[PDB]
Structure 1
């Protein structure tokens, strides 16, 4: 993980978007590519459609998701089974 002294990582644009959403009080999904962005307390409640390489997959943020990153909840590979 990232160093504690450096703080958490979130993409600036993403953060801005989140802030805007908060200000509004809207619940329309924000399509995002920043899979590397950490989830924040203020992001709780928002749906945020994270890119998985191919498509944006909706992620309703929860109290448990905070420390994690957005890419953790948007699996890229699509394996069903060998038979």
Structure 2
């Protein structure tokens, strides 16, 4: 956990266009902190291959952006291993 006195992790994002025009924000900044001003905004978070669209909620505030954009999908085992 980042020290509180340092302040939240902050990154330049096109928030003005999203607040007024409603354009979704597409970013690779998965380490940015969801500030309370991002509630109700449409984000699209990179995951290495594709940008996952999510809309920030009140409960998500304070978390990081990449916490909702999984990078590797669920592990599965092919039972019919054969040989």
> Which category of TM-score, normalised to the shorter sequence, fits these structures?
0.7 to 0.9
CA distance in 1, matches of 2:51, 2:73: 14
Partner of 1:49: 44
The counterpart of 2:28, out of the listed 33, 41, 60, is 33
- Large movers: runs of 4+ above 6 Å: none
Q: Please, which runs of 5 or more residues in structure 1 have no aligned partner?
A: none
The counterpart of 1:73, out of the listed 56, 68, 72, is 68
Larger radius of gyration: 2
Q: What is the RMSD of the two structures over their aligned residues, measured on CA atoms?
A: 1.3
How many equivalent pairs are there? 78
CA distance in 1, matches of 2:10, 2:49: 22
Q: CA deviation at 1:19?
A: 3.6
CA distance in 1, matches of 2:23, 2:77: 38
CA distance in 2, matches of 1:47, 1:20: 11
Q: Please, which runs of 5 or more residues in structure 2 have no aligned partner?
A: 79-83
In the superposition, the TM-score normalised over structure 2's length comes to 0.84
Partner of 1:21: 18
Going by fraction, where is helix more abundant, 1 or 2?
Answer: 1
In the superposition, the TM-score normalised over structure 1's length comes to 0.84
Going by fraction, where is strand more abundant, 1 or 2?
Answer: 2
Q: CA deviation at 1:64?
A: 0.3
